[PDB]
Design a binder for these strands. Structure first.
Length: 431
DNA sequence: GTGTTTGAAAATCCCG
DNA sequence: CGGGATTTTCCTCG
RNA sequence: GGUGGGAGGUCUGUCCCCACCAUGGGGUGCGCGCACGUCCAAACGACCAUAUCAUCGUUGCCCUGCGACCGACGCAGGCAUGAUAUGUAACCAUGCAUUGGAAAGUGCAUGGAGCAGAAGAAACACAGUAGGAG
């Protein structure tokens, strides 16, 4: 009767929220800045055909950036020689297989630039790290002993991060996953019995709003024979008697089930669209960015600053005191702009969070009841041909819905492929 | 939106 | 001053 | 009684707290009152204070007056609207410094955080939010 079922998992990522002291948050911010500086400097040196960053030339002269020269200690030593602020980040966040270069840079150069040599690709198309896409993440390796769940509370744990002392407090410890040969151990029981990986990857991320999250990735090592190197389970709830379900997507409903139940697509954007438009037109007039009277002002004053520096340097010879080059500042957004910016970010975060949780609820309720799903297509680009759904689908981001259905129908191993829904289910059964 | 991934073991550095 | 904490090193990239 | 929100990992209601609207109208039943259920009325990312400004009749009115034309115009004014900045916000307990004879705040270190029902795979990369430079 709707009993929870423990099933084996190949990968997992506990998403908790850190509650660090201001010093701890400052240190992690410095670590993020160090990572972004490393990325930017390395991927500016990649375009110069530097042998220390770029690999061995081919017989034609084609040179690719070999990342082994980026994970070696010599490159990091040279980097920390060039600037000291890069040393404020752990070398594991850079030199490891889940670090800055071997994981992020490799994917960036294999997807964004389509895997092309630095002598045949431009700089404008490559995406750096800046205010538009800041590096709010670092991945390090910590043993399980650095994760000590609090005994009193079922959802509180203390996390110690490298270069930070204080054992940052964490909330959101999912106790619905069990470790061990058959998932009969808690976290402490598995750690004390030596059934956890001696090195575990954790990602510390800072979202758009001021907040911190941690992702403790649990991954089985090898797949030799049939026994995983590290075994962890998770209890999920399934309907006592599952029945085949044909899924049809309508206009006013996010999903229609052949059984009869319905879920009305809340579509939280429009219900909050007035507030979003009000805030947008608000900060469009404030003294922060996205105003066209602050962007232009900052860009201009930067231009005259550069021109004055040039005129002071070469024409004046920079002897002792030539003229007086004014520096001042490069402008900063005001507090009244900042509060509305933070509130706006909080509000899209709330909308996205509401949509994510609603889609999780719908997918969990439908996956357990269904033994064989009958969705039309895996891609939303194949359902906009009629264009009728476009108005609703503009806010109804069904990419997340499709992904959630995909990885919630596979853990129970449910295969994936009202009158219309019944016809679709019948066709799927026939095929 | 669409696609792809997810450590383990030594060599070296440093505070009660 | 020596065990533990941090740094490195592994492998494949046109 | 409603609306919006701040912290308790996420969603709904409740718990604690912050800022606002209502104490209205109507269509019908019963004996001016009670109203079975509603529909409209608001309140939508704070509120107060401080300066510095709307501008093509604006930013509405008072026209506070003045002047000329034949209801309309200009000049010198005032409030209220709106809109940009400075100080100021949102659960509980302890310690320190500082304001306070107190009552109670300020800043720091922290420490703790539900209740009922659902769930909880995260990150990165690329057409974009358009920029950042090395």
């Amino acid at each position: 009767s709707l009993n929870a079922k423990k099933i084996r998992l190949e990968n997992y990522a506990m998403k908790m929220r850190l509650y660090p002291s201001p010093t701890q948050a400052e240190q992690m911010d410095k670590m993020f800045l160090a990572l972004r500086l490393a990325y930017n400097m390395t991927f500016h040196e990649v375009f110069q055909q530097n042998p220390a960053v770029c690999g061995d030339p081919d017989e034609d002269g084609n040179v690719w950036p070999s990342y082994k020269k980026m994970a070696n200690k010599t490159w990091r030593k040279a980097l920390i020689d060039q600037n000291p602020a890069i040393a404020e980040a752990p070398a594991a966040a850079i030199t490891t297989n889940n670090g800055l270069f071997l994981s992020n840079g490799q994917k960036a150069w294999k997807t964004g630039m389509h895997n092309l040599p630095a002598n045949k690709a431009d700089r404008k198309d490559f995406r750096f790290y800046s205010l538009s896409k800041p590096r709010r993440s670092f991945a390090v390796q910590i043993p399980p002993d650095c994760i000590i769940p609090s005994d009193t509370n079922q959802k509180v744990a203390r996390i110690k991060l490298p270069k930070i002392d204080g054992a940052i407090k964490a909330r959101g410890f999912n106790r619905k996953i069990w470790f061990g040969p058959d998932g009969k151990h808690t976290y402490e029981e598995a750690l004390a019995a030596h059934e956890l990986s001696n090195n575990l990857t954790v990602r510390v991320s800072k979202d758009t709003c001021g907040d911190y999250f941690i992702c403790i990735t649990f991954s089985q090592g090898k797949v030799k024979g049939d026994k995983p190197t590290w075994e962890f389970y998770q209890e999920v709830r399934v309907s006592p008697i599952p029945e085949p379900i044909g899924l049809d997507v309508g206009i006013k409903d996010i999903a229609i089930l052949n059984t009869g139940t319905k879920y009305e697509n809340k579509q939280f954007k429009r219900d909050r669209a007035a507030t979003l438009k009000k805030m947008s037109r608000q900060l469009s007039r404030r003294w922060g960015p996205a105003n066209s009277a602050f962007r232009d002002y900052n860009k201009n004053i930067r231009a005259e600053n550069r021109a004055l520096e040039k005129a002071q340097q070469d024409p004046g010879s920079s002897g002792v005191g030539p003229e007086a080059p004014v520096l001042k500042s490069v402008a900063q957004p005001s507090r009244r702009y900042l509060t509305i910016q933070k509130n706006r970010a909080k509000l899209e975060r709330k909308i996205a969070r509401r949509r994510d949780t609603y889609y999780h609820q719908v997918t969990a309720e439908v996956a357990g009841k269904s033994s064989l799903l009958a969705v039309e297509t895996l891609r939303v680009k194949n359902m906009l041909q009629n264009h009728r759904l476009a108005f609703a689908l503009s806010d109804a981001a069904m990419s997340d819905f499709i992904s959630k259905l995909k990885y919630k129908a596979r853990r129970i191993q449910v295969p994936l492929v009202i009158n219309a829904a019944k016809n679709i289910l019948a066709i799927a059964q026939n095929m």
